[PDB]
Amino acid sequence: LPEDPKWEFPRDKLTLGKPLGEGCFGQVVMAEAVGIDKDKPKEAVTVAVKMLKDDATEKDLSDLVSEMEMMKMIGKHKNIINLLGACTQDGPLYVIVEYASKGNLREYLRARRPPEQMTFKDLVSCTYQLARGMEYLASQKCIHRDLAARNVLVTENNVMKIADFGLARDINNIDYYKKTTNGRLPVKWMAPEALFDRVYTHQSDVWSFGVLMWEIFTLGGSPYPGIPVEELFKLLKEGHRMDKPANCTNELYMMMRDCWHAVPSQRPTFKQLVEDLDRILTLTT
Ligand SMILES: Nc1ncc2c(n1)-c1ccccc1[C@H](c1ccccc1)C2
């Protein structure tokens, strides 16, 4: 792997710890990184390190490289899991990212369901934060393509952070109209044109954000309950959309439905979503 001194972090200053996440598609561990904050050269920072599993394939390696490279191009933002460094030379590839102690959002919400609970303000704030992260991502010309509650992480101070940039691309790096394009996107979060037309734009992410909203307001509900993946797209072509979640206003549901407009250009932009959610959150608070 080519040297990138700006991002390179010393292996001797990194102490690997306990496993994080389910570990299906990569190996992620908690770690202590000494001096990773360059203003505090002697302070250990609790980080997350992504690396290859023992059963990794050649494609796993080139995917992990591409994910790291993608995260290099995305500047710092509070509502995004940011790259902190990498160990690339003379050993196994470690991709060092921000640690979020409270795990993924789906589990986070499911665990605080009533049999401290989420308030309505908590849920709108969560939605607002993610709209902001996605607004920033889109401004960086990045399409995420895998927006979902499982791919949002939450910190100790309850900050929502978009994670998992394995499917993320620069907007110009999509092989348009090729039958393989978007073949690896989870179908239940996926805009119809991503499959039907083999394209992916920022407006495709907007659809997924609608799904994510539904997840949030159902406190980690599973989309399209009782509908198998195999029959979803016929139903979507026929105009099927998910019903309003109980603990969510008509206004917020109308926002979800807007996100699920059949016509991509008729969906809101992330900019507009941020503005509307800002207004709602302000009035709620
Ligand atoms: N609790 C927790 N904090 C941080 C991460 C993960 N889990 C986690 C758990 C499983 C998979 C991924 C991740 C995250 C990730 C994001 C982007 C690149 C590399 C790692 C890092």
Q: Which helix (H) or strand (E) holds 270?
A: helix 270-284
Per the CB < 8 A criterion, the answer to whether 179 and 198 are in contact is yes
The number of CA neighbours under 13 Å toward the Cβ of 7 is 25
The resolution, in Å, is 2.1
Q: How far is CA 57 from CA 26, 61, 155, 274, in A?
A: 11, 7, 31, 40
Q: For strand 14-20 and strand 27-34, is the pairing parallel, antiparallel, or unpaired? A: antiparallel
Dihedrals phi, psi of 57, to nearest 5 degrees: -100, 170
Dihedrals phi, psi of 88, to nearest 5 degrees: -120, -25
CA distance 139 to 162: 15
Ligand 1 binding pocket includes 144 (Cβ within 6 Å): no
Q: How far is CA 91 from CA 19, 20, 157, 230, 238, in A?
A: 20, 22, 35, 43, 52
From the list 32, 26, 72, the residue with the least C-alpha distance to 50 is 26
Task: Kindly state the DSSP code that residue 87 receives in the 8-state scheme.
Answer: E
Instruction: Give helix 250-259 / helix 202-217 axis angle, nearest 10°.
Output: 150
| Exposure string for 110-122, b = 16+ CB within 10 A, e = fewer | eeeeeeeebeeeb
CA distance 252 to 244: 9
CA distance 110 to 277: 23
Cα 32 to chain centroid distance, Å, stands at: 24
In three-state secondary structure terms, 122 is helix
Taking the alpha carbons at both ends of the chain, their separation in whole angstroms is 50
**Residue 99 annotated as binding?**
yes
Q: How far is CA 122 from CA 119, 158, 217, in A?
A: 5, 10, 10
State the distance from the centre of ligand 1 to the C-alpha of 151, rounded, in angstroms: 9
* Beta partners for residue 153, in sequence order: 104, 161
Ligand 1 binding pocket includes 47 (Cβ within 6 Å): no
In three-state secondary structure terms, 88 is coil
Long-range contacts of 177-182, Cβ-Cβ distance < 8 Å, separation of 24 or more: 182/145
**Residue 22 annotated as binding?**
yes
DSSP 141-179: TEE-S---GGGEEE-TT--EEE---SS-EETT---TT-T
CA distance 36 to 195: 41
Ligand 1 binding pocket includes 164 (Cβ within 6 Å): yes
3-state helix, strand, coil in the chain (%, to 5): 40, 15, 45
CA distance 174 to 202: 12
CA distance 108 to 115: 15
Q: Which tokens hold the place of 210?
A: 């609608």
Ligand 1 binding pocket includes 84 (Cβ within 6 Å): no
Instruction: Give helix 120-139 / helix 202-217 axis angle, nearest 10°.
Output: 170
From the list 266, 256, 259, the residue with the least C-alpha distance to 124 is 256
Per the CB < 8 A criterion, the answer to whether 171 and 137 are in contact is no
> Solved how?
X-ray
State the distance from the centre of ligand 1 to the C-alpha of 23, rounded, in angstroms: 10
| Nearby residues of 11 by Cβ (< 8 Å), 6 or more positions away | 87, 90, 91, 94
Q: How far is CA 7 from CA 25, 162, 215, 235, 237, in A?
A: 24, 21, 35, 46, 45
* Beta partners for residue 126, in sequence order: none
State the distance from the centre of ligand 1 to the C-alpha of 258, rounded, in angstroms: 30
Domains, the chain, in order of start with CATH, read 1-99 (3.30.200.20), 100-279 (1.10.510.10)
- 63 catalytically annotated: no
Measured in residues, the chain has a length of 285
Active-site pick, 4, 55, 60, 146:
146
Q: Which tokens hold the place of 84?
A: 């902190």
